[PDB]
Every structure is written in structure tokens, then in C-alpha cells.
Amino acid sequence: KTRKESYAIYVYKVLKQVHPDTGISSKAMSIMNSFVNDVFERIAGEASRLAHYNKRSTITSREIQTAVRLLLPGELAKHAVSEGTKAVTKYTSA
Amino acid sequence: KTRKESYAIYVYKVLKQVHPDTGISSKAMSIMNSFVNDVFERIAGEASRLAHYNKRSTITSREIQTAVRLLLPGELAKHAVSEGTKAVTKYTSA
Amino acid sequence: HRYRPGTVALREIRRYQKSTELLIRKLPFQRLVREIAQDFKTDLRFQSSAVMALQEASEAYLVALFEDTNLCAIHAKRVTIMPKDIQLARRIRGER
Amino acid sequence: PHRYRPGTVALREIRRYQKSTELLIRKLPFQRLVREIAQDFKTDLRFQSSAVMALQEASEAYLVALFEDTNLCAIHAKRVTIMPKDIQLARRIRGERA
Amino acid sequence: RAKAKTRSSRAGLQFPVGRVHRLLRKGNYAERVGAGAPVYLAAVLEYLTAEILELAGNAARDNKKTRIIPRHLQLAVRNDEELNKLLGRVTIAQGGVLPNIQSVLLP
Amino acid sequence: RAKAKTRSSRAGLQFPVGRVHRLLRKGNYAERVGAGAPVYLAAVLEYLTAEILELAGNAARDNKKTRIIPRHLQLAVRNDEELNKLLGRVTIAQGGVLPNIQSVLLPK
Amino acid sequence: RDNIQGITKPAIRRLARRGGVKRISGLIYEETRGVLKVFLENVIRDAVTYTEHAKRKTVTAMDVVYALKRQGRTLYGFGG
Amino acid sequence: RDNIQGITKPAIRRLARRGGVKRISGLIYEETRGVLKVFLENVIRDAVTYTEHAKRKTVTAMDVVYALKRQGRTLYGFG
Numbered sequence: 051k052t053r054k055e056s057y058a059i060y061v062y063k064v065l066k067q068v069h070p071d072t073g074i075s076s077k078a079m080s081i082m083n084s085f086v087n088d089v090f091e092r093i094a095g096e097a098s099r100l101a102h103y104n105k106r107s108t109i110t111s112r113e114i115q116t117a118v119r120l121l122l123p124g125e126l127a128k129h130a131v132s133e134g135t136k137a138v139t140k141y142t143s144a
Numbered sequence: 145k146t147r148k149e150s151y152a153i154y155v156y157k158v159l160k161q162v163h164p165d166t167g168i169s170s171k172a173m174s175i176m177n178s179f180v181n182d183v184f185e186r187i188a189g190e191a192s193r194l195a196h197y198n199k200r201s202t203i204t205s206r207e208i209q210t211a212v213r214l215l216l217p218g219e220l221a222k223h224a225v226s227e228g229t230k231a232v233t234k235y236t237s238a
Numbered sequence: 239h240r241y242r243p244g245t246v247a248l249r250e251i252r253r254y255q256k257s258t259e260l261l262i263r264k265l266p267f268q269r270l271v272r273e274i275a276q277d278f279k280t281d282l283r284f285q286s287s288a289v290m291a292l293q294e295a296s297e298a299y300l301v302a303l304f305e306d307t308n309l310c311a312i313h314a315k316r317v318t319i320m321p322k323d324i325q326l327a328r329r330i331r332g333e334r
Numbered sequence: 335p336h337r338y339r340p341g342t343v344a345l346r347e348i349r350r351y352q353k354s355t356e357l358l359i360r361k362l363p364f365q366r367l368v369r370e371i372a373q374d375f376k377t378d379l380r381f382q383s384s385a386v387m388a389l390q391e392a393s394e395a396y397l398v399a400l401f402e403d404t405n406l407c408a409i410h411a412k413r414v415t416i417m418p419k420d421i422q423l424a425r426r427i428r429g430e431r432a
Numbered sequence: 433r434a435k436a437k438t439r440s441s442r443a444g445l446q447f448p449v450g451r452v453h454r455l456l457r458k459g460n461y462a463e464r465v466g467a468g469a470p471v472y473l474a475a476v477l478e479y480l481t482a483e484i485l486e487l488a489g490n491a492a493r494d495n496k497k498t499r500i501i502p503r504h505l506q507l508a509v510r511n512d513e514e515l516n517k518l519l520g521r522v523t524i525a526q527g528g529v530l531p532n533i534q535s536v537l538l539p
Numbered sequence: 540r541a542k543a544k545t546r547s548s549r550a551g552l553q554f555p556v557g558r559v560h561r562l563l564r565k566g567n568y569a570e571r572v573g574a575g576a577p578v579y580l581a582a583v584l585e586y587l588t589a590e591i592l593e594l595a596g597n598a599a600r601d602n603k604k605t606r607i608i609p610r611h612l613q614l615a616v617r618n619d620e621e622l623n624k625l626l627g628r629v630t631i632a633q634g635g636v637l638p639n640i641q642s643v644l645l646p647k
Numbered sequence: 648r649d650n651i652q653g654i655t656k657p658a659i660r661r662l663a664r665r666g667g668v669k670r671i672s673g674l675i676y677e678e679t680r681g682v683l684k685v686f687l688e689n690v691i692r693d694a695v696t697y698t699e700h701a702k703r704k705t706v707t708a709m710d711v712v713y714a715l716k717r718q719g720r721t722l723y724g725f726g727g
Numbered sequence: 728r729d730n731i732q733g734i735t736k737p738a739i740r741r742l743a744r745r746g747g748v749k750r751i752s753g754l755i756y757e758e759t760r761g762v763l764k765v766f767l768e769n770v771i772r773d774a775v776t777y778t779e780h781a782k783r784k785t786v787t788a789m790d791v792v793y794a795l796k797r798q799g800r801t802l803y804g805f806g
């Protein structure tokens with residue numbers, strides 16, 4: 051049978067991080083999978099448009115940062131930006 | 145200087161085909177250029193989505209026809225399809 | 239014994255705003271969907287998930303439309319919703 | 335002396351301003367307002383003339399469409415006057431202040 | 433070699449097929465682009481442009497004017513059902529509005 | 540060759556950096572994709588998932604339940620201004636509606 | 648083949664109750680049926696177009712999801 | 728700088744007349760000023776974000792056009 055990739059194990063890992071004794075059903079996992087795919091596509095499309103506007107041919111972390119700033123509303127965006135930066139720096143150190 | 149391509153001479157050719165005695169100003173030409181770019185972007189994006197859904201690496205005339213049928217409203221779409229089809233016939237024969 | 243008009247209506251409002259189920263019978267909706275799709279292609283098949291998704295979308299759309307209709311009716315100093323409220327809500331939303 | 339009944343000059347103005355295509359807001363006050371608004375986001379910002387012109391065109395189109403919806407809301411409640419509750423209802427139904 | 437013949441003339445169009453092909457190839461839409469996709473797209477764009485310009489020129493003529501200004505484009509688009517539905521969320525600069533007064537307001 | 544360690548472990552994440560990089564490369568977004576873009580995207584996605592899951596788990600706990608169902612996700616999203624703005628045009632299956640009644644209709 | 652009457656008056660009344668409506672006029676039901684038929688026609692037409700492009704004969708759930716997302720009515724839970 | 732008062736009452740009356748409004752209550756001018764301020768704040772914030780991404784100090788017409796387009800308010804006539 052052909053393998054069907056999904057964001058299920060990662061969503062479950064995050065859920066165990068946040069609520070260690072709370073489970074999740076199958077419909078809720080489908081909804082979370084759709085949410086992750088939707089947000090990924092939105093941010094990636096905005097970043098691609100930003101790259102095309104400035105006559106660049108590379109999607110960098112600055113394009114992703116500006117796409118997150120444009121798309122996510124208010125305080126959310128700020129926190130998201132922080133998290134993103136917090137990752138890249140760490141990734142560079144190792 | 146630099147070169148700035150636009151759909152101005154082609155729009156003027158179509159206008160001379162339709163209204164041989166009627167001219168067009170500069171703001172109206174800017175509006176027409178924006179309209180052509182917007183419709184091109186819409187149709188091409190929808191065709192790209194259609195190709196991605198079916199796991200195809202190629203944009204063909206079938207994708208363009210389906211995008212036209214999905215986007216253009218009402219009898220407009222029908223007429224557009226005819227025009228497009230005729231072109232792809234006259235191009236293939238010659 | 240008999241409740242005053244508008245009491246059971248409020249009870250029903252409170253009851254159906256707590257549940258999550260579908261408020262339209264499934265078989266009539268499936269028949270309606272098949273009849274509508276008959277006019278586009280002949281001898282069409284439907285996955286069960288397709289009909290369920292159509293039902294969910296339609297019910298959500300109708301509930302939101304009725305919320306807007308209730309707002310329009312209250313604007314005119316009324317309690318009942320009339321077709322003119324539906325038409326105004328749809329026209330302002332851009333659907334007509 | 336001569337005098338027109340209330341609503342005659344209003345209808346004349348409605349007919350006059352639905353036939354023209356000009357901009358109905360003075361350009362210098364709008365430019366000053368745009369600069370003051372943009373002052374919060376970044377300091378020492380320069381604007382092209384086309385940027386301000388585009389902002390003015392978009393703002394005027396938005397306001398005219400909102401006033402059309404507001405007029406519909408006012409007529410719904412059997413009125414001729416335009417009240418803030420009509421603006422609020424139109425913006426709620428449109429999905430803006432909802 | 434033989435003399436060059438543009439693909440637009442070969443397909444009988446006025447819009448450019450080579451430029452449309454290049455824009456499709458460099459626009460990041462798909463890994464490959466077919467041979468007949470630019471021809472179809474150019475034909476569709478030419479059809480829509482001809483429709484808009486026909487209506488706009490008629491509006492200009494009814495106004496006793498020779499040149500087409502944005503007001504005529506707005507009148508052409510807004511008075512046509514299909515074109516109004518296509519350009520439903522689009523603002524045309526210096527276009528104005530459509531003359532329309534509610535009947536209840538009239539004396 | 541050293542022992543392979545995932546990129547998401549170096550960044551200290553749970554979402555997959557490698558899969559996100561592959562999806563960015565294969566998705567026809569741009570000709571080239573930088574080395575730090577997948578890490579940023581994975582971090583942002585993990586943040587959003589953690590936020591919405593925390594809210595949904597709180598909503599489930601307030602209902603004296605143990606398992607998250609779509610009703611709890613809808614209650615979490617609709618009760619939060621930023622998340623409601625992010626998901627304004629989104630329908631959640633079997634979510635229901637937020638309980639409210641206009642003050643005009645209540646008996647006086 | 649008059650299955651538009653399968654959407655009965657009690658069902659429309661329940662849908663109105665979920666929307667917070669207390670009193671309903673008698674002519675609301677025909678208007679609601681027309682509105683629902685228009686919405687269904689648009690969505691199903693788009694879904695059938697998506698199905699036909701794939702050279703299939705069954706209308707899958709993903710076709711419906713894409714058709715809804717085209718109109719700006721993203722739906723979570725069915726498909727991916 | 729209180730430049731929101733530069734959008735005068737007669738200007739709002741003209742914008743309402745183009746919209747077909749016959750009679751106008753005296754309380755809609757402050758409401759219209761608030762609505763316009765909110766709209767302008769959103770659009771200008773997006774335009775300045777687009778400008779800052781390009782490492783520029785001048786807000787071009789293309790930034791405004793993109794900021795409007797990403798809100799579903801496409802504007803034709805400025806490129």
C-alpha cells in the first residue's frame with residue numbers, strides 16, 4: 051500500500067509536550083493536519099511572492115519572517131517571529 | 145537606461161482591430177495592462193494548482209482549459225474556450 | 239398546562255447551540271445532491287465523504303446566513319425574520 | 335426671496351457627484367494624514383506622489399461602497415436619514431467589525 | 433535557414449506567444465510547460481481584451497468622445513453582468529460610480 | 540561517516556525540518572531555498588500548533604473530558620481574537636457554534 | 648424528482664434555532680430552499696469540473712474540498 | 728498632529744452624495760473618520776512592511792498596490 055504522509059506524529063508529540071495526559075481523536079487529528087497544511091501553504095506562497103517582487107530567486111529566512119509578519123495577526127505574529135529566530139540561531143550554533 | 149516590457153502595443157493592435165477610429169489615453173492603457181497581468185496571473189496560478197493536484201509536472205492546454213472554465217464566469221468562459229481551442233488548432237496545422 | 243410563546247423557542251435555541259450534530263436528515267440531502275449533480279454529468283458516483291463534506295459546508299453556510307438575518311431583523315425593531323432580511327444580508331455580503 | 339425645499343439640492347448633488355470622476359477629498363490634508371499615520375510604523379519615511387494618489391483612490395472607493403451599504407441599511411429600517419448604527423451593521427455583515 | 437515566423441502569426445493572434453511562454457517558464461508555476469499552453473493563454477487574453485475594448489469604445493462613442501478614458505472602462509465593466517462578476521473586487525482608478533438613486537428617495 | 544542526527548534535533552524542534560525543506564523544494568515556490576528557511580517555517584508551525592492545542596486541551600478540561608474532539612478545537616479558536624482573525628474564513632467539521640443570544644429576545 | 652422538499656420545515660427551523668433566531672416568518676422556508684439550491688449548485692459544479700479534469704467518474708471528498716476552497720470557504724476535517 | 732480633522736464635514740458629505748445618500752445625521756462624521764483611520768492604518772502598515780523588506784526608505788506605488796491586493800482590494804491604474 052502506498053504510504054500517506056501526514057503531520058500526525060509531530061502533532062502528537064507537541065500535544066504530549068503541552069498536555070501530557072490528554073489524548074486526541076481522529077477527526078481532531080484530521081483538523082490539525084489540515085490546519086498545518088493550510089498555514090504552511092499560506093506562508094510559503096507569501097514568501098514566494100516576496101521573492102518574486104524583489105527580483106530574487108531564493109527563499110531565505112528573511113522572506114519567511116516578512117511573510118509571518120504580514121499574515122499572522124497582531125501579538126501572534128510577534129511571538130511567532132521570536133520562536134523562528136530562536137530556532138535559526140540555535141541551528142547555526144550546532 | 146533600462147527596458148520595461150508591457151502589453152501596450154498588443155492592446156493597441158486589438159483596439160485598432162475593434163475600433164479603427166478610436167484612440168486610448170495613458171491612464172486607460174495602464175488600467176488595461178494591469179487587467180491583462182491580473183488575468184494572466186489568475187489563470188496561470190489556477191492551472192499550476194490543477195497540475196499539482198493530479199501529480200503532474202507539466203502545464204498543458206488541458207490545465208489551461210480547466211482553469212478558464214473554473215475562473216471565467218458564465219457564457220464568457222464558454223466563448224473563451226472556443227477562442228483558445230481554435231488557436232491551438234491553427235498553431236498545430238502550421 | 240401550556241408554556242407561553244417564545245419559551246420553547248429559547249429552550250430550542252439553547253439546545254441546538256450546544257450540540258454539534260447535523261440538523262438535516264442525511265438521505266434527503268444525499269438525494270438532493272445527486273439530483274443537482276445530474277444536470278452537470280450523467281451517471282456520476284459520490285464518495286460518502288463527499289456528501290458529508292457538502293452537508294457540513296451547507297449547514298455552516300445556512301447558520302451564518304441566519305445569524306446575519308437575525309441581526310438585520312433586529313435592526314428594523316422586529317423579532318421575526320422575514321425574506322427581506324435574508325435579501326438584505328445577502329446583498330450586503332456581496333452574494334446579490 | 336427664492337428658496338428650495340429640503341431635499342432638492344441634496345438630489346441635485348447626488349446627480350452631480352455620481353456623474354463626475356474626480357477626487358472628493360482635498361489632497362494636502364489627506365497627504366498630511368497619511369504621513370502622520372505612517373509616522374508610527376517607521377521614522378523619516380518618504381512617499382512617492384503615486385503612492386499617496388493610490389492611497390487616496392483606494393480610500394475614496396472604500397468609503398463610497400460603505401456609504402452605499404449604509405444607505406441600504408437605513409432604508410431597511412424605514413428611514414431616510416443615515417445613522418451610525420447603519421454603518422455599524424453594514425461593517426458587521428461585511429465581516430469587518432464582526 | 434528559413435525566415436523567422438513568430439508563433440503569434442502562426443497561431444493567428446495579436447498577443448505574444450513567445451513572451452507568454454517565457455513568463456510561464458520563469459514564473460515558477462510548474463517544472464515543465466507544454467507547447468500549446470502559451471497559445472491557449474494568449475488566445476484567452478486576447479479575447480478578454482477585445483471584449484473589454486469593444487464595450488469601452490461603445491461607451492466612449494455614446495459620450496461623443498474619440499479617446500477611451502478610465503470612466504469608459506468603468507462604465508463598460510459595471511454595466512455588463514459577466515464582466516462585473518469577473519472584476520467584482522477590483523477598483524478602477526478615476527472610474528467613478530454608476531448613476532443609481534433609490535426610488536424611495538425620489539420625490 | 541558520523542551518526543546521522545536530524546536537523547530538527549539540532550534546532551531543538553519536534554516538527555520535521557527535512558520534510559519541510561523537501562516540501563519547499565518540490566512545491567514550486569522559488570528556484571532556490573536557503574538553509575535557514577526550513578528551520579524558521581518548522582519553528583513557526585510548531586508554535587502555532589502548540590498554541591491551538593493548549594487552548595483546545597484547556598477547553599476539554601473545562602468540560603471534564605480527556606480526549607480532544609472538534610468541538611474543543613472550535614471553542615478554542617472562536618474564543619480567541621487572534622486565532623479567530625487567522626481562521627475567519629475557515630469551517631471546522633463537527634464544531635458547532637459559539638453559544639450566544641441577542642439581548643432583545645430575552646424576556647423582560 | 649422534487650427532492651428540494653426533502654429539506655423540511657422543521658430542519659430549516661432547527662438551522663435557524665442554531666443561528667439564534669427566536670421567531671420565524673412563514674415565507675422564510677422557500678427563500679431558504681432557494682438559497683441552499685444556489686449554493687449547492689455552485690459548489691457541485693466546481694467539484695464536478697475538478698473530477699472531470701482528473702478523468703474520473705466518482706466525486707471524491709478532495710474535489711469538494713478544493714471546490715469549497717475556491718469560493719473562499721476552506722473546510723477542515725475532510726481530506727488534507 | 729490632529730490631521731484626521733483635515734477630512735472635513737463637507738468632504739464626507741460629498742463622499743456620501745456619490746454613494747446615493749440623501750439625508751445625513753450629524754453623528755456620522757466622527758464614525759466615518761474612525762472608519763477611514765482604521766482602513767488607512769491597515770493598508771499603510773502592510774505597505775511599510777513591504778518597503779522595509781526591500782531595504783528602502785521610500786514607499787513606492789507598487790508597495791501600496793501589493794498591500795491593497797493582499798487584502799482583496801485590487802487597484803487598477805498604478806502598475
